[PDB]
Amino acid sequence: DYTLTRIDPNGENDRYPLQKQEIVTDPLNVFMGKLNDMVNWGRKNSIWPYNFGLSCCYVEMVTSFTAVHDVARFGAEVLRASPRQADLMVVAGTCFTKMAPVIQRLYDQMLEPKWVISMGACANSGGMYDIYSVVQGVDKFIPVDVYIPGCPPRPEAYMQALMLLQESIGKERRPLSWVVGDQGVYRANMQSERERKRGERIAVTNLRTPDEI
C-alpha cells in the first residue's frame, strides 16, 4: 500500500513530472524504523511554506497565518521567501499558462524534501476557468500531495489540509541519508477522506434552516 517515486530529470522522458511511480509494499529494523519515525515526526511538525501565491486562494492561506487562526500553533508559520528554505509549496491560485513555467522553475528550485498542496478549484482542476489562458489543474505537471476543494477554501480548510499532509508525512519513507541506502520516496496510499467520512456524512438528517443568523 505504498507508491514509490523515483525522479529522473536527465532521463529519456520529456513530459513533466520527470519521475516514475510504481505501487510497492512497505519497505519497513528495530532502530532504523524508530529513527525514520523520528525524522517523519520532525518533518511533519516543522513545515515551512513557500511564500508564493497566484490569486485569491493565497489571501485565504495568509489569513490562516494571522492571529484569528494562528497556523503558527502547528509550527507552519515561518513562510520563507526563498524556495531553498521552503518545504511546502502551496499552489494557492490559478495555474495561468504564462505562470506555468514559473511554477515549474520554483518547484525545481525547492530542495528535498518537498510537498505540494493544491489549494482551491483553480489549482485542482482549473475550476471555473475552463478558458484559453489557464492550465486545467496544476497536477498536469506538478505532483500534488494534498488537494483542497473550495473557491477559496476558508483558512481552516487550509489548516485541515495541513493536518492531512502531516498524517501523510508521518507514515512516508524517505532516504535517511543520500550516501547509503534506497533513495526513492515512498508515500503511503491512504484511504480516501470521502470514503472515511461517508458513514458520518450520509447519516446527517436535519440541518439548520437558512432563515436565521
Partner 1 sequence: MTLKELLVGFGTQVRSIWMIGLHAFAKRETRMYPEEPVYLPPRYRGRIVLTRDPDGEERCVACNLCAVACPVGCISLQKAETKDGRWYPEFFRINFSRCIFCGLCEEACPTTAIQLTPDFEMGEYKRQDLVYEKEDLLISGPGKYPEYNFYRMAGMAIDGKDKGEAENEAKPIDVKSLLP
Partner 2 sequence: EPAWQTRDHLDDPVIGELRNRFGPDAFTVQATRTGVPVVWIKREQLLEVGDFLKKLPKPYVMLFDLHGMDERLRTHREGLPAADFSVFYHLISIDRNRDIMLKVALAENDLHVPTFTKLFPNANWYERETWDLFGITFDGHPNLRRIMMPQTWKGHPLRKDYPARATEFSPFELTKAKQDLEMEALTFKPEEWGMKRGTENEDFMFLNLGPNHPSAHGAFRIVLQLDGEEIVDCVPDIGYHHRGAEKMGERQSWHSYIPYTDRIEYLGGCVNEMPYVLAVEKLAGITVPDRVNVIRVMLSELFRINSHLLYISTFIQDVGAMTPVFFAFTDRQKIYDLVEAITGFRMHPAWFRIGGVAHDLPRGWDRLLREFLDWMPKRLASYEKAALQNTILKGRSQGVAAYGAKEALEWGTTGAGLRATGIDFDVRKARPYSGYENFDFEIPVGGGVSDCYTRVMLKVEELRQSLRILEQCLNNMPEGPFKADHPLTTPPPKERTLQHIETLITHFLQVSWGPVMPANESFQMIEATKGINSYYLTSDGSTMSYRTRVRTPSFAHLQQIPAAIRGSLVSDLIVYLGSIDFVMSDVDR
Q: Which residues of this chain interact with partner 2, rule CB under 8 A?
A: 14-16, 51-56, 58-60, 63, 66-68, 81, 93-94, 96-102, 104-106, 126, 128-136, 140-141, 151-152, 154, 210-213
Its sign, for the CA torsion 88, 73, 64, 151, is positive
- Rounded distance, CA 28 to CA 83, Å? 31
* Cis amide leading into 17 (omega within 30): yes
Q: Which of 36, 40, 94, 166 binds ligand SF4 (CB under 6 A)?
A: 94
What is the contact mask toward ligand DCQ in residues 102 to 141, using x (rule: CB under 6 A)?
Answer: ----------------------------------------
Pairing of strands 185-188, 2-7: antiparallel
Matching residue, cell 524508530: 34
- Is 62 among the residues that bind ligand DCQ (CB under 6 A)? yes
CB atoms within 10 A of CB 182: 13
State the residues that interact with ligand DCQ by CB under 6 A: 51, 53, 58-59, 62, 65-66, 79
Q: What is the contact surface with ligand SF4 in residues (CB under 6 A)?
A: 55-57, 93-94, 120-122, 127, 151-152
